[PDB]
Amino acid sequence: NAMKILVDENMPYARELFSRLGEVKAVPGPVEELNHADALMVRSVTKVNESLLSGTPINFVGTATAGTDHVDEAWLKQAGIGFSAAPGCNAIAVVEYVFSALLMLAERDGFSLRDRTIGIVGVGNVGSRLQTRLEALGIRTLLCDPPRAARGDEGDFRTLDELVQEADVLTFHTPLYKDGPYKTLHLADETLIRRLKPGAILINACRGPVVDNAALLARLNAGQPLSVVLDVWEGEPDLNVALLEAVDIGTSHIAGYTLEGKARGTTQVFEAYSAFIGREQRVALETLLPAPEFGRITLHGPLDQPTLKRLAHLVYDVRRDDAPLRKVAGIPGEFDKLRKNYLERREWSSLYVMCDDETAAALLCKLGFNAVHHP
Amino acid sequence: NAMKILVDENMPYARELFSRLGEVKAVPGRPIPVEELNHADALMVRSVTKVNESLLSGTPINFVGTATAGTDHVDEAWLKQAGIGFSAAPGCNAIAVVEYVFSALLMLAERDGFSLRDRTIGIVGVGNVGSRLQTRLEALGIRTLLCDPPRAARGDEGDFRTLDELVQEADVLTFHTPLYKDGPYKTLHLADETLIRRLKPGAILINACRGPVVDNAALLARLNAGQPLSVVLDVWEGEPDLNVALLEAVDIGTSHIAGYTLEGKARGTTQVFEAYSAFIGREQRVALETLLPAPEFGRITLHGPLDQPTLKRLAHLVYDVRRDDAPLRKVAGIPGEFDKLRKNYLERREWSSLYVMCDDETAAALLCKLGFNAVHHP
Ligand SMILES: NC(=O)c1ccc[n+]([C@@H]2O[C@H](COP(=O)([O-])OP(=O)(O)OC[C@H]3O[C@@H](n4cnc5c(N)ncnc54)[C@H](O)[C@@H]3O)[C@@H](O)[C@H]2O)c1
Ligand SMILES: NC(=O)c1ccc[n+]([C@@H]2O[C@H](COP(=O)([O-])OP(=O)(O)OC[C@H]3O[C@@H](n4cnc5c(N)ncnc54)[C@H](O)[C@@H]3O)[C@@H](O)[C@H]2O)c1
């Protein structure tokens, strides 16, 4: 008469949390416990399907990821088995990766970020959060999301062609669709890339094939005035290395990797499961996380661009992941080795900022720092 | 019957500081009206004023101050002969330069994925800057070799090695000598063609002293030949007309700004204020914090022990040398922009302006030794 919850043994905080609801056995991502369990919380490694579950009493499957590729959500729901992913769990990580790249390019190239026009392609978990933060800085942002538009969501949704005409930063946050009216495979092909404004910045931290890597390379090689930030590559793990040499920032598909991010995976699945069994519970994310290296800092004066750059980069400077990828890119095994070995990264909210300036604190909070004003 | 003190009208904090000791009149440094020198008790100058018998003869001036690290514009011997007090500001800008060097090295260590404590640092010239660099590398347990024959010939105590020995055993080589055109200590092109070529594979070469200490032509020649070398340059042969292709090739190139911190610049006036206070029987020490505006980031907490990445984050919160390398690459071949970058140089602070509270006592001890204002808060 209590629930037996199997959790993956390398899933952070899983034992801590799930015991608020039942007995936890930690399985490596083993038959005997499956047939005598009521719930299963997994990571990407475990294919979840009829094969593995049919016949068991398992009544709920949580996956601690934004992704769901490795699960057949369909069969479970067909079967009456509750399911939950952790959508958006890594979203803030990507937004701060994007901000980290932009603030570096803004200093390196002597331009003013508040002056840019930013087109967001895909306004979902990642793009909507990016929109919120760009707006708080008063940066004009153009939104492109034909599905949301078609479905009747509110907002000023423009066409991709419109974004290409008006933006000088273009960032992609769509899924990978290979056909249909919303096809995103090679959404950024030679024709689109070629129309990009002089000095435009192209950012792809979503899925590799959304950008045609060979065409992008060719335009860069012909001298198109264009800056590029890539976190995802066609052909991963065997990226186009020549392309890496021509981009301003390339990293090994680590944009989503923060500590807070891994912990939200476990956290959301906990909350869904707690709701599933009539015991809705929430969890302080700060109760779980170890203190970061730099926890508190004072700020004197207004927030300006260089001040914001020093703040974000104190937490995460994208160049620390760019440099090691350049050192090993054409060596088989190494791309994947940099993901497995990924070093601890925190989010801006882990940093407590004490501002004597009221406006700097208001702005920092809207950017996602834990900022306060000191009268 | 108050002291009359003449101050170069462009020296920072001059009136604020000296009007504590006497009447203070601001004067241009070139030329100084003679009526003024004739009624003055003390003169505080910058490098534009040649101080010698022609300037001071027959005047009542009993002390000369120069808010300046160097003493080329001053006839010190003559001042001794005449009984006139003198003070420069030796080392006023040394910490600026050292924190600049650390900024560059911490950037390269991350970029290239090496640990600092696996590098051997040869310091050439071990005076005000060289010996501060030493202290700090040694506090980090980084192996350093010292080269400074003028100190060895004086019989100074230390492990003084020859230049050539540094070239065999060091993979970081950094120059802090003045420029001597000849004599036994000639530093002109001290790092020439032959010397550069012998630098260990993966070597890092830094020059933040005087442009012509390193043969820029030879260096470019080696780089073009494909020698695995890293180069950090803040000073250049033929400034402001630097070798542009040598710029495109170095890892970091900045526009002779290594010494430019608010602290460096205010310390010229400070050390001279201090020396003069003592000279007239009013020994007075003055703390920079009460003169300089408060810094943007004045306090931060550090949880746990220091490691290299943590130290890089701290040094670069304060000063990331890349912020000076980037503007120079944008405008290097445009005649006049180099001087314009120095003229409008934006505020830079020293590590001592960051107050660091560490829950690890050994992190505190170390950061303190490194020049942060670090304190253990259990
Ligand atoms: N780089 C990383 O480490 C990492 C981390 C997190 C997410 N991602 C990827 O980034 C992408 C965005 O993630 P998310 O969490 O926001 O997912 P999401 O499902 O919340 O949002 C995707 C949005 O794109 C929109 N979209 C679909 N087709 C489009 C089209 N053709 N043109 C414009 N918009 C379109 C959808 O309507 C949806 O609003 C996904 O591909 C995700 O897998 C990568
Ligand atoms: N880049 C900048 O913005 C900047 C700022 C400050 C100082 N500097 C320069 O850096 C140099 C160091 O300044 P400092 O305050 O340490 O001066 P310093 O006089 O205290 O140091 C010079 C040291 O070098 C030694 N030396 C002389 N000739 C040598 C040689 N042949 N080989 C090895 N050592 C030799 C001397 O014995 C002395 O110890 C100065 O020349 C100064 O002009 C540059």
UniProtKB/Swiss-Prot annotation, chain B:
Gene Ontology MF annotations? 4-phosphoerythronate dehydrogenase activity; NAD binding; protein dimerization activity
What are its GO biological-process terms? Answer: 'de novo' pyridoxal 5'-phosphate biosynthetic process; pyridoxine biosynthetic process
Query: Which residues carry out catalysis?
Result: R210, E239, H256 (proton donor)
Q: In which pathway does it act?
A: Cofactor biosynthesis; pyridoxine 5'-phosphate biosynthesis; pyridoxine 5'-phosphate from D-erythrose 4-phosphate: step 2/5
Annotated residues that bind NAD(+) are located at D148, T177, D234, G259
> Which GO cellular component terms, listed alphabetically, does the Swiss-Prot or TrEMBL entry include?
cytosol
Annotated keywords: Cytoplasm, NAD, Oxidoreductase, Pyridoxine biosynthesis
Please give the InterPro entries that the UniProt record associates with this protein: D-isomer_2_OHA_DH_cat_dom, D-isomer_DH_CS, D-isomer_DH_CS1, D-isomer_DH_NAD-bd, Erythronate-4-P_DHase, Erythronate-4-P_DHase_dimer, NAD(P)-bd_dom_sf, PdxB_dimer_sf
Catalytic reaction annotation: 4-phospho-D-erythronate + NAD(+) = (R)-3-hydroxy-2-oxo-4-phosphooxybutanoate + NADH + H(+)
Give the EC class as a word.
Answer: oxidoreductase
Q: Keyword Disulfide bond: yes or no?
A: no
Query: Subcellular location, in the record's words?
Result: Cytoplasm
List of residues binding substrate:
S47, T68, Y260
Q: Which PANTHER family match?
A: FORMATE DEHYDROGENASE 1 (PTHR42938:SF9)
Family named by the database record: Belongs to the D-isomer specific 2-hydroxyacid dehydrogenase family. PdxB subfamily.
Q: Which NCBIfam families match?
A: PRK00257.1, PRK15438.1
Instruction: Indicate what this protein is called per its UniProt record.
Output: Erythronate-4-phosphate dehydrogenase
Q: Per the UniProt entry, what species is this protein from, by scientific name?
A: Salmonella typhimurium (strain LT2 / SGSC1412 / ATCC 700720)
